[model samples]
Target: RFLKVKNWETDVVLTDTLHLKSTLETGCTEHICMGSIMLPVRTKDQLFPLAKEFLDQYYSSIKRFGSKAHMDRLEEVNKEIESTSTYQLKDTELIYGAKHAWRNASRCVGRIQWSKLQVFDARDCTTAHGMFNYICNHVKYATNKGNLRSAITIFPQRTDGKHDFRVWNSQLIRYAGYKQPDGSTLGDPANVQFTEICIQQGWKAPRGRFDVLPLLLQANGNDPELFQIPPELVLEVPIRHPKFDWFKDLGLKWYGLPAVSNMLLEIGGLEFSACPFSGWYMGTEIGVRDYCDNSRYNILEEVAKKMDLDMRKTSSLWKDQALVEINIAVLYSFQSDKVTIVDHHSATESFIKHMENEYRCRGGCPADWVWIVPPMSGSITPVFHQEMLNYRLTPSFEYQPDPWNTHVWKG
Candidate 1:
């Protein structure tokens, strides 16, 4: 059993609704088998219309301002949208589409700052070494001494009917997990499968609990390349409570940045498999989901025990109580460390404001209700009460194969 706390929040204008709990990072229950999804696609025929419509509208927006030669080139791009199997995005076009994709991302509640994302065009690089340097630059830039900025580095888009450039690691930043002879795991349990793959690929596993995993980069048919994140480059927060002394002894810490590396960024039928995007962490993403989840750290029991709550008494809400404090500790830890993070309440508030802003600009907002709500304490936030719809929209991102499924692993 675990200690529990009331999910009620005084800062939020709580809306009475369902009391069911939810989480952000999804984990699969594994026993005999493990599975994952391939990058979903729309055939060229299906996306051709979308590509044309968006490109035409894009062209028209700037048509009056360009030189005749440039305008003619734009028109040719528009014409080529039909016959050319690959859609090419110019630098400016890529910048434009990337921002829209972030804005169109249904599950992202941090769209208030979506327009501010920095687009790094590293598409020119073909080798793993160049990819490594560019990614390091991105991490340093995005980290920004704790004043974190959202950023996306788009590598070369897939072309000529072949999968070319892809960042093999799911994220530029990840923890290493060394699975022991016993069934238990050391380090981040979330990274166990991935860490095992890294070991098999020939990287020596440093015997540490929270060691950052080196980036595994694969370019076309080349072997996967591993690059370690510089120790000084990574900013992490040591978790401690405002009042609870024992909480510090738990010896927990978390990385400040959450750059998603494994997802595909789809723009006007073009696929950028190596596009890595990131935003500052939302508290629940680290606190409630990562730390409290049974499959990950599974720290609820530890927190509850430290709190001196009765473990046998599930009705007393010991788990919930501990969960709430754990979340509180996360927020406190980040703030004290001067690292950027979004509290769930403010995130949802910004999301509602984001919807209002989108309605003004695009007539209506596309959203997924389940994903829009924060995982920590749901229903109370304003987003939980509103209706939502999920659909396929152009200039969006989607999930791709896991690192193991791709040539990133030792094959």
Candidate 2:
């Protein structure tokens, strides 16, 4: 039997009264009260007219003997307002009218129509605030589904005469099934199977491609040793006179003359020893020499010293402290013409250990491991499709001529 539990949903309820209180306390000031009237304040009510007159007289003394360019623009705007037909006008007219009206009120009290002053009325302030709430709520509602709970919570805080509220506490609602015993879904246990599936998918395509074994079998006629090349043969040689102009132009100029001389000597040796049939000639000799020198134990020591000096010139801005918890799995297929078998446990463990050791020796962190079962039949297919010679010359070590056990993993 499963646990029966209701999800926790938190809602942020915004009221007009809250908006009103905030606007009254934060939007009105002495300057605003005194700037509502200037030139024969026009109002539909007697009380408003008297208030407007009082504001105009209070601000009149502060009026300066400066140019009236701004005032002239205001007058032009007012004339436009008077001439425009209300019924034919669009939302633009309403916006302009509201702004002009606020401007007139502000001027009466010797204050400019700043944003703070414009939102003085509770009704207008509530409308503007609700717009933000509406958009945020809509998005949350749209994205919220299937055991997901979403809502907004606003927190109002007051400092002196100012009234400010932290808005929108949008969060996903969590059910008992979605949360772990520790009350954290960061490592969701309910979706462990789903998470495992995702990890499996990622591991199958790890580092962009599959890690097929590089093994070649020898035919009865050809050289057997050459067929079974060692992993050590996969060398990292430098590209001398790289045929690329950019590299030649950059050249080996950073190190002192001794370094240059050593590089040249090593390159000369590579030139003499590289196999001619392998197309390992030309400037590639110089490249191989450079690679050997760089990988040399003594040369690496000198390079490390130079690296320390370089690091001194550079600054480490910040350290990553967050720990990432992840799960990874790898699966390898062992196949032959006669039989196809999947070994999840041992194969994955060995593969992971091999990868870890390789990366660790080159200064890398440890990664988690998981085992998988792939669905490919064992067969002696050519690994390199583009190179015809590789397909024809390269023999299969894992696959045999007999169709019954053509594909097999010996190692």
**Residues 202-252, model 1: lDDT tens digits:** 889886878899888877546777888788999899999999998989989
Error of 1 at 188 (Å): 1.6
C-alpha lDDT values of all predictions? 0.76, 0.20
- Each candidate's TM vs. the true structure? 0.85, 0.13
Model 2 residue 28 lDDT score: 29
- Clashing residue pairs, backbone N/CA/C < 3 A, model 1: 2-319, 3-318, 3-319, 4-317, 4-318, 4-319, 4-320, 4-321, 5-320, 5-321
CA error at residue 296 for candidate 2, angstroms: 43
lDDT (Cα, tens digit) per residue for candidate 2, span 43-146: 22332322223223223323522236334433443444345310111233223323322222211111121112111111122222342333234323322321
Provide the global lDDT of candidate 1 against the true structure: 0.76
Which ranges of candidate 2 are over 4 A from the true structure?
A: 1-123, 127-133, 136-162, 170-179, 183-411
Give the lDDT of residue 303 in candidate 2.
29
